[PDB]
Amino acid sequence: GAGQIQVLEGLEAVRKRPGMYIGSTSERGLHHLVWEIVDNSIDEALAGYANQIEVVIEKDNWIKVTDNGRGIPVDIQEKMGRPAVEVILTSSVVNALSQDLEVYVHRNETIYHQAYKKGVPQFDLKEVGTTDKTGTVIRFKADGEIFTETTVYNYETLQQRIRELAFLNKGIQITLRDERDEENVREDSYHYE
């Protein structure tokens, strides 16, 4: 009850003053979206679980981030009455500032999916398949109502920071791929010691 209401208010707050939360709604804040998600994958690597992160720029400037960590948990979270992944993602600034966001969790030999719009879940978390892997996939589309100047990512910007993050976080393989033009796909992959 109260907990879920807290959530909605939090989404409203973020969408009303997005620059207070991500610095700006310029091109810089657009790329900050990617940094927020990649930092979560880095934390799961530092915790000992993940070692591979992939960032894909998809057609129409969707971003897909994939890690091979444990998978965000799906167990019903005691204070919300809702799956843990739903709590974590409805408290995410990226989700609030995305027109659409999808999660796929590989965990417990199961693939779970949920989708969101401006942070609001579109359906309850569902089992959609099976798996013998663990990890988490998040795909999002930046909200052009927030990012009013541009929602087009800059590969070089992405590449320079990804390269830095792999250099700083030795052992994690981090891959960037641009699939926006299916006729000319570019990938860079970084892996320091």
Task: Kindly state the tokens that stand for 55.
Answer: 């960032």
Q: What is the C-alpha separation between 79 and 67, in angstroms, rounded? A: 27
In whole angstroms, how close is the CB of 46 to Mg ion at the nearest point?
9
Total residues contacting ligand 57X (rule CB under 6 A)?
Answer: 13
Q: Interacting stretch for ligand 57X, rule CB under 6 A, among 18-26, 65-73, 117-125, 147-155? A: 65-73
Tell me, residue by residue from 51 to 80, as one string, x for binding to Cl ion by CB under 5 A and - for no binding.
----------------------xxx-----
Which residue do the tokens 């965000």 mark?
A: 72
Through-space distance between the first and last CA atoms of the chain, rounded to whole angstroms: 48
What's the one-letter identity of residue 128? V
Contacts of 105 (CB under 8 A, 6+ apart): 71, 72, 74, 85, 111, 112, 113, 135, 136, 137
Task: Kindly state the tokens that stand for 164.
Answer: 């830095």
Q: Does 43 participate in binding Mg ion (rule CB under 5 A)?
A: yes
98-117 positions binding ligand 57X, by CB under 6 A: none
- Given a contact cutoff of 8 angstroms between Cβ atoms, the answer to whether 64 and 185 are in contact is no
When binding is defined by CB under 6 A, the residue of 15, 70, 113, 161 that contacts ligand 57X is 70
Where do contacts with ligand 57X occur on this chain (CB under 6 A)?
37, 40-41, 44, 65, 67, 69-70, 72-73, 88, 136, 138
Residues lying near Mg ion in the complex (CB under 5 A): 39-40, 43
In the complex, the residues that contact Cl ion under the rule CB under 5 A are: 73-75
